Amino acid sequence: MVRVAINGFGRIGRNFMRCWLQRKANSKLEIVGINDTSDPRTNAHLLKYDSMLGIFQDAEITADDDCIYAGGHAVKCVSDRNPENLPWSAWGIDLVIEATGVFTSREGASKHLSAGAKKVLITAPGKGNIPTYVVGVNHHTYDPSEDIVSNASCTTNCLAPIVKVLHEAFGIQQGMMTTTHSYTGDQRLLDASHRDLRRARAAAMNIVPTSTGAAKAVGLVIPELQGKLNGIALRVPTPNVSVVDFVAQVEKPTIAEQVNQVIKEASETTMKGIIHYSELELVSSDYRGHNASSILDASLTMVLGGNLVKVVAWYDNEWGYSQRVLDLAEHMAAHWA
Amino acid sequence: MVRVAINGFGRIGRNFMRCWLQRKANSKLEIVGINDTSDPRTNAHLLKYDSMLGIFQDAEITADDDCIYAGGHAVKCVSDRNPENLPWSAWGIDLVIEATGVFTSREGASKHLSAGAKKVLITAPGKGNIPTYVVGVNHHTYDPSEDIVSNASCTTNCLAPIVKVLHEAFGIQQGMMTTTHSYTGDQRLLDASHRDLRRARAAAMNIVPTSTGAAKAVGLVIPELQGKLNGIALRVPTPNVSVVDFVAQVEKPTIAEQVNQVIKEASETTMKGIIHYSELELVSSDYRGHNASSILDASLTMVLGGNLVKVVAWYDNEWGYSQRVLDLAEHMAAHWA
Amino acid sequence: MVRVAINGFGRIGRNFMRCWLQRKANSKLEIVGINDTSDPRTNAHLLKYDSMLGIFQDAEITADDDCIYAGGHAVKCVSDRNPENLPWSAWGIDLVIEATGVFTSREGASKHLSAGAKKVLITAPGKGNIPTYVVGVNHHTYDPSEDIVSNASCTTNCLAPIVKVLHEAFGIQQGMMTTTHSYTGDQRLLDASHRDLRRARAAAMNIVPTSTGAAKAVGLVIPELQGKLNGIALRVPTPNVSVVDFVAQVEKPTIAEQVNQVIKEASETTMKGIIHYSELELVSSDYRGHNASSILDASLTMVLGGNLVKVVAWYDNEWGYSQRVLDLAEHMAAHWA
Amino acid sequence: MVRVAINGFGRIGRNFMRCWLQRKANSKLEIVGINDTSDPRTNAHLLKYDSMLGIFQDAEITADDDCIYAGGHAVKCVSDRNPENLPWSAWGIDLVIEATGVFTSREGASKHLSAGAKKVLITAPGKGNIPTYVVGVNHHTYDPSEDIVSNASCTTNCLAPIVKVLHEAFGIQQGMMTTTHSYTGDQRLLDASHRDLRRARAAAMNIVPTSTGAAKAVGLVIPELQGKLNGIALRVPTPNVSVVDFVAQVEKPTIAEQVNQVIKEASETTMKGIIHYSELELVSSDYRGHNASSILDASLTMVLGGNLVKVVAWYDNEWGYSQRVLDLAEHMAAHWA
Ligand SMILES: NC(=O)c1ccc[n+]([C@@H]2O[C@H](COP(=O)([O-])OP(=O)(O)OC[C@H]3O[C@@H](n4cnc5c(N)ncnc54)[C@H](O)[C@@H]3O)[C@@H](O)[C@H]2O)c1
Ligand SMILES: NC(=O)c1ccc[n+]([C@@H]2O[C@H](COP(=O)([O-])OP(=O)(O)OC[C@H]3O[C@@H](n4cnc5c(N)ncnc54)[C@H](O)[C@@H]3O)[C@@H](O)[C@H]2O)c1
Numbered sequence A, B, C, D: 001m002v003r004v005a006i007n008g009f010g011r012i013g014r015n016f017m018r019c020w021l022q023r024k025a026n027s028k029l030e031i032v033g034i035n036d037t038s039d040p041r042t043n044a045h046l047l048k049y050d051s052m053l054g055i056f057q058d059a060e061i062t063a064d065d066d067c068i069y070a071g072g073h074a075v076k077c078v079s080d081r082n083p084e085n086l087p088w089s090a091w092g093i094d095l096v097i098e099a100t101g102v103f104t105s106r107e108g109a110s111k112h113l114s115a116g117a118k119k120v121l122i123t124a125p126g127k128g129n130i131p132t133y134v135v136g137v138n139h140h141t142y143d144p145s146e147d148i149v150s151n152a153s154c155t156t157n158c159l160a161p162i163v164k165v166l167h168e169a170f171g172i173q174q175g176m177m178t179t180t181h182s183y184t185g186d187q188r189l190l191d192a193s194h195r196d197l198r199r200a201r202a203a204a205m206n207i208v209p210t211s212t213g214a215a216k217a218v219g220l221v222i223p224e225l226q227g228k229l230n231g232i233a234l235r236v237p238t239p240n241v242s243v244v245d246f247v248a249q250v251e252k253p254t255i256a257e258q259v260n261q262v263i264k265e266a267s268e269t270t271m272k273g274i275i276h277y278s279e280l281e282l283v284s285s286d287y288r289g290h291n292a293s294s295i296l297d298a299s300l301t302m303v304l305g306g307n308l309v310k311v312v313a314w315y316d317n318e319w320g321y322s323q324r325v326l327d328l329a330e331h332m333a334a335h336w337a
C-alpha cells in the first residue's frame, strides 16, 4: 500500500480525491495528505458540494481544523505555500501529486523530493526535460527510478491516443489541431489585470483564443512525430467539458468510414477504457463525468482527397484527466521500485 | 432610387434596417416595406432596444399600428405568413430581402416574384441551383436578369475571401474548416423538441456540434474548388460573434509569415473593406460591430511541413453579414436592369 | 391501478416520466400514453439524455415509431395538436396530465374530458375558477368528483407551504415576494418577436423582470389571505434552479431565530417531505434534483421591527414541481371515485 | 485644477478613467497618477479594449513602460502594493481615489495621507466611522477638512436616493431590500478556495446569495433611518448591470400610481441626473452605460394595504457608480479647502 499526497486541492485535486473515493477497493494507494491555501473547514465543503459534479453521495464528508474525515477514513491536511516546510518524511510520503500549476519546473517540483518525498507526479506539461507519460500510449515505458514524472495537459491526454491509432494505421506526415476548450480557472472573471492579455478578458462573455504547445507534447510522447504537430486553443463559455478538432495529413489514402472502423476496433482491442466510440448525436453536456479520455464523435469524421483526415473528440478535462492521473498513479504503484 | 422590402424582421432584418439607417446618404435603396409575424408596435421596440448593439442613438424610432417612423422616415409594415397575399405591386417593390429562413427553395422564394416583386435577394444558402454571390469574391459576375439571387451563409461569407486569396497566391489542393459559431435562434433554449437532435439541446449550456454544407458553398462561389472543401461547426454559448478555423493543404510551399504578408497586402489592395488584418491580441467581444467580413487573427497562423496552412478568422455573423447583404443590395441597385 | 397519460412531453413531462421511473414500485399509476409534437424517435432520446439531469441510468430507453420501451415497460405515443382527435377511450385513460402550457382554460382542458378522458390534472395556474391544489397545504380538501384539477405554478408550489406555516404560527397581515427565477422555455433565445416585450429579449444575457399573479394563487389555496399577497419575478440566466424571496408583515412580533425554529420543527412534524431545512451555506446548483419543494435558507432569515419577516427559499422548478405533480396524481389515485 | 490619482486600476478605475476621458472639458480634475499590480503595457490595452463597454473610440490610447498617452494627454503610472513607498508628494497629489478593495479601514487608507497625499476618496463602504457621502442625497454636508471620505457601495448608491424621496414624501417605518446583483470580480470562476463559502462557488453557474450591510449604509447617509434598513444580495450570472428590489413599510397610506408620480416629479426637480424614470418595458442590457444612478422601473411598483410599497430600480454598478465617484470628486474639487 502506497501512501500518497496531493499538492493543491483545486479542481484536479478535488476530482482526484473524488475518483479515489469511487475507486477505493482496487487501490494500492491511500491518500494521507493534502495541502491547499485554505483552511481544512472550507475545502471539505468544496469537496462535498461540487457545483459541477453535484453533491457527493456515497460517503460522508466532515472535517475539523486538523484532519478531514471522508467516509470514516481520516486524511491529514496542512496549509503552506513553501514546499520546503512540509511534513513529508513526518508523514511517510512515497508519491506526491503536484497539482498547483506552479511547480512546473524540475527545480520547483524537486523541492518536494528534497523536503522528504520519494516520487512526484506533476499534472502539468512541465518546463524542461521532465519525462512525460500518457496512460494508453506510453504508460509502460517509464523507468521506475524516474521519480519526477509528468502527465501532460488534458488536451494532449485526449489527443495522443487518437494520434497513436492514426499513426500506426495510416502514418502521419503533418497534423494540426484546434481544441474548443472549456474555460479554466486561470482566466479572470471580469476584465482584470493578467500576465497574458488574451486571458485577461472576461471568461463568461468571450471566445478567447490562446496559443498552446500542448499539441507539441504529443511529439514528446510519440517521438517520431515531434516538430510535426501544432495547434491553438479556443476557450468558450462552457464550464466543464471540451472538444478537440484534429486535422492530420496522412499518406496512406483512405475514406471517412475506414478511419471510424479503425478507431472502433481500437476502442475494443487496445484503447479499451481510453477511447470510447459513440455513433450517437450527442452534445457536450452528455460527457460530464465520462470515464474515457476521448470520445470520438463518429458523425463528423471526414476525409478530403484521400490523404487529409479530420476527427473531433469530446473529452472532459476535469474528470477524465483526473481518471488518467489516478490510473498513472496506480500504475506506478504496481511497479514501485 | 430603388424601393426595397424585408421579409422577416428578425436578427438579420433588424441589423439590415440598422445598417441602412447608418448608411442612408450614400444609398440608392429606400426601405419601404417590412413584414414580421409580430405587430408593428413590438418590432419597433425591438429595433430601438437591441440587447446586443445597445440602444440606437442617431434617429428616433416610433410606431403606430400601420406604419413605423424611423427618424421621421416612414416605412410600411404588415403581417402575413403566406407570401402570396402580400401587397408588393401595391407598394412598388423592386427587391425584397428574404430573411425568414423559411423560403430557401426556388419555388418558395419565387412566390414573392409571382406576388408582384421584381427581384429577391435571399440571405441563406438556398436549396437548388440558386445563383449565389459573395461581396468581395464574385459580386461582379451576376447577370442582372437573375432576379432570384442568394447570399450564402455567414460562415461562407467570412471564409470565401480568405480561400480566394490563398487559392490565388498558393493554390489549394484540399481544405477543412471548423467554425466555432455563436448560438443562433434556431436552437431551443432548454431541452425542447426539435427536428435535429443536436440542436434540440440547451444553447446556453453546451458546445453543440453540427454538420454544415456551408463550407461547400465556397465551391459554388469558387468553381474550381468544388468537392474539395468541407467542414463542421461548433455552437458555443457566446451570443454574438464567432471565429472560423481553416485548414488548407496548399501545394506551393511557404511559411507562416508569408501568408500573413499576402493577406495583409490583400487587405490593402483588393479585399479592402472585406478583410481586415489585426496584429493585436484581441478576443471575441472586441469584434462586436466590426465592419469587415473577416478579421484575420495574425498571431495564430501556422504552417506545418510547408504545404499545410491554418488560419483563423474572427467574424460577426450578425453585423458584418448584414453589411455584406446591404452591399450586395446596393451593388445590384447600381446595375439595375 | 390507474392508467394515466401525459399531454405535452416537454420539461415537465420528461421530469414526470423520469420521476415515475424512479418511483415505480410504490405507484398506483401506470403511464400508458404520451403525445408531443415530435416523433417518437426524438423524444425517447430527449428522455434518455437530459442535459440537466444527466444521462438516465437505471432503465433502458429505446423506441420505434409507434411505442417507447422504457426499461422493458412499453408506453404508447402519438402526435396531434387537436385534443379532440385523441385516442383516450381507445386507450382507457382515467387521468391525463396537461403539461403543454396551452390548455389553461376550463374549456380548453375539458376537451380531453369530452374526447374520452375521466380526469385531467393541469400543471399550470389555470384561467377561471379551476380548483387548485398544492401538496402539503390542501391536498386533502379536494372533492373526487372534481375531475379538472389544477396544480399551481412552481413559485406558488414553493411559496405556499412557508406561508401556511407562518400564517398558522404568527398570522399574516400582508406579504410581498420576489422570486429570482430560472429561465424557462417561453423566452426567446435571441431577441425575437414575442407577445410580451419583456420575454422577447435574450434569455442568456439578461435579468428580465416579469409580473406574475402566481403570488395571488396562494390566496386561492389559502382562502383567508386572498388579495393580500402579490409579487414579481426575475428571470436570470441560470438554467435549472431558482430562489424565492418572501417578505411578510406578521402581527405577532418575534425574532429571526424563532421563525427558523418554527419552520425547523414544521419540517419534522407536518411538512416532512415538503419543506427541507438547511443550515448550510449552499448555493444554487446544490439543489438540482432535491426532493423537497422548498429548501429554507437559514442564514438569511431576518426580522426588522419585530413585525416584518423575510425568508428565502431555494426550490427546483423542474424536479420538485414534477415531484409534487406526481404526488398529487398518486394522492388522487388513492381517493379514486 | 486639482491633480488626482487612482489606486488600483481595476473595473472602477478603468471606468473612472473612461468617464474622465468623456468629461474632460468641464473638469477641475486632471488625472496624473495610477498604480496597478500590472505593468503599464497591459492596463493600457485593458483600458482601450473593454469587453463590456466595447472599444474606446474618442481618443487614442498608447503606452510605454513609464507613462500612458491617452489622447495625447500623458499620465504617470507605477506599480507597488505597499502604499507607503509611493511617489505622492513627488507628483503633487491632492486627491487619491482608493479603488483596490483592500484599504477599507481608516488606518489602511490613511497610509496615503501619511505617504504624501492630501485627500483620499475611497470607493467602498469603509470599516469604522469614515464619513460617507452619496451624490444626490448628502453630497453637500461634508466638511472640507474631512480628507478621508467614503463613497458607499453601488447598491447603497442606487438605493439611497429612492429611500430619500420616499422618506420625505411618505415617511418610512421599516424597509427591506433584495438586490439582484451582477457578479463581481471577488467571486472565483470555478469552485476555488475562498474566505467566504458562498463566494467560493462558480460565478457563471449559480445564483449565489450573500449577506450585505450595504442596506444599513443608507442609515448612515440618512441618519433617522439607521437600524431600520436591512437586506441581502443575489449574485446571478449577468456580467454588468443589476436591479434592486426595495420593500418599504411607509406609514402615510397611498397607492401605486402616486409613488410613481412622486418619483417622476422628483426626477425632474431635485434628483435630476441621479434618478431617471422609465415607463418602458425594458430589460437589463438596455441599461449598460446609463448615466443615472437609479432607473426606476415603473410598471412593477406596487402597494399592498396602503402602507407597504415595493419598488425596483435598475442600476449599473460599473458605470453609474463611476459617474457618481467622479461627480463626488469634482464636487470636492469645487469646495477645495
Ligand atoms: N482546469 C482543468 O480542467 C485542468 C485540466 C488539466 C490540467 N490542469 C492543470 O492542473 C493544474 C491545477 O488546475 P486546477 O483547475 O485545479 O487549478 P486551480 O487554480 O483551480 O486550483 C489550484 C489550487 O492550488 C492552490 N495552490 C496554488 N499554488 C499553491 C501553492 N504554492 N501551495 C499550495 N496550494 C497552492 C490554489 O490556491 C488552488 O487551491 C494546472 O496546472 C492546470 O493547468 C487543469
Ligand atoms: N442568425 C445569424 O446570425 C445569421 C447569420 C447569417 C444568416 N442567417 C440566416 O438568416 C435567416 C434569419 O436569421 P434570424 O436570426 O433573423 O432568424 P430569426 O428566427 O431570429 O428571425 C426570423 C424572423 O422571421 C419571422 N418569420 C419566420 N417565418 C416567417 C414567415 N413565413 N413570414 C413572416 N415572418 C416570418 C420570424 O418569426 C422572426 O421574426 C436564417 O436563414 C439564418 O440562417 C442568420
Ligand SMILES: NC(=O)c1ccc[n+]([C@@H]2O[C@H](COP(=O)([O-])OP(=O)(O)OC[C@H]3O[C@@H](n4cnc5c(N)ncnc54)[C@H](O)[C@@H]3O)[C@@H](O)[C@H]2O)c1
Pocket (backbone or CB within 6 Å): B190, B192, B193, C007, C008, C009, C010, C011, C012, C013, C035, C036, C037, C080, C081, C082, C099, C100, C101, C102, C123, C124, C153, C154, C184, C185, C186, C317, C318, C321
Ligand atoms: N418550465 C418549468 O420549469 C415549469 C415549472 C412549473 C410549471 N411549468 C408549466 O409547465 C408547462 C410546460 O412547461 P415546459 O417547460 O415543459 O414547456 P415546454 O414548452 O418546454 O414543453 C412543452 C411541450 O409541449 C408541446 N406542446 C405544446 N402545445 C402542444 C399541443 N397543443 N399538443 C401537443 N404538444 C404540445 C411542446 O411542443 C413541447 O414539446 C407550462 O404551463 C409551464 O408554465 C413549467
Ligand SMILES: NC(=O)c1ccc[n+]([C@@H]2O[C@H](COP(=O)([O-])OP(=O)(O)OC[C@H]3O[C@@H](n4cnc5c(N)ncnc54)[C@H](O)[C@@H]3O)[C@@H](O)[C@H]2O)c1
Pocket (backbone or CB within 6 Å): A190, A192, A193, D007, D008, D009, D010, D011, D012, D013, D035, D036, D037, D080, D081, D082, D099, D100, D101, D102, D123, D124, D153, D154, D184, D185, D186, D317, D318, D321
Ligand atoms: N465591481 C463593481 O462593479 C463595484 C461596484 C461598486 C464598488 N466596487 C468596489 O470597488 C473596489 C474595486 O472593484 P473592482 O471591480 O475594480 O476590483 P478588481 O479586483 O476587479 O480590480 C482591483 C484592481 O486593484 C488591484 N489591486 C488590489 N490590491 C492592490 C494593491 N494593494 N495595490 C495596487 N493595486 C492593487 C487589483 O489587482 C486590480 O488590478 C472594491 O471595493 C469593490 O467592492 C465595485
